[PDB]
Amino acid sequence: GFKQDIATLRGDLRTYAQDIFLAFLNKYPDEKRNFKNYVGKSDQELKSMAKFGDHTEKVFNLMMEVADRATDCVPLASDASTLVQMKQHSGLTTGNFEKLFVALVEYMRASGQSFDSQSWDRFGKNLVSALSSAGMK
């Protein structure tokens, strides 16, 4: 289920983080609008870029902590508040996060592996609600 999925993703986190974030940026190419230096790069080129590796690993390091601290796929209000309050997320709306979780669920569905895709779908929706409650537009 959900907790085991966190362990699976942590076990190869750099590769899952890059593959899932690339699935997001390829499904919703307009989200590259939020990351200038990503436009006109292939996936291999992005994976070469220091900053891409470091942003995407920090995103998934913290996401896995938020999933880990959740009860039954409901994240802590404190985690939502932290994500809203981050200066790096100043321009963002809940829709950005919704799209990341849609791509993550599709990635899991397409994988040969027994991820609990329905639990990640619920976790995404719960996180979007929490972010709205914590003040995200």
Taking the CA atoms of the chain, what radius of gyration do you get in angstroms?
14
Q: Which stretch binds ligand HEM (CB under 6 A): 10-18, 40-48, 53-61, 113-121?
A: 53-61
- Calpha distance 76→9 (Å, rounded): 20
Q: Which of residues 18-37 bind ligand HEM (CB under 6 A)?
A: 31, 34-35
- Calpha distance 96→76 (Å, rounded): 19
Q: Does 107 bind ligand HEM (CB under 6 A)?
A: no
Distances (CA, A) of 117 to 73, 78, 103, 107, 133: 12, 25, 11, 9, 24
Select the residue interacting with ligand HEM from 23, 46, 73, 100 (CB under 6 A).
Answer: 100
**N residues, the chain:** 137
Choose between 99 and 118: whose C-beta lies nearer to ligand HEM. 99
Select the residue interacting with ligand HEM from 12, 15, 26, 51 (CB under 6 A).
Answer: 51
Select the residue interacting with ligand HEM from 9, 17, 63, 73 (CB under 6 A).
Answer: 63
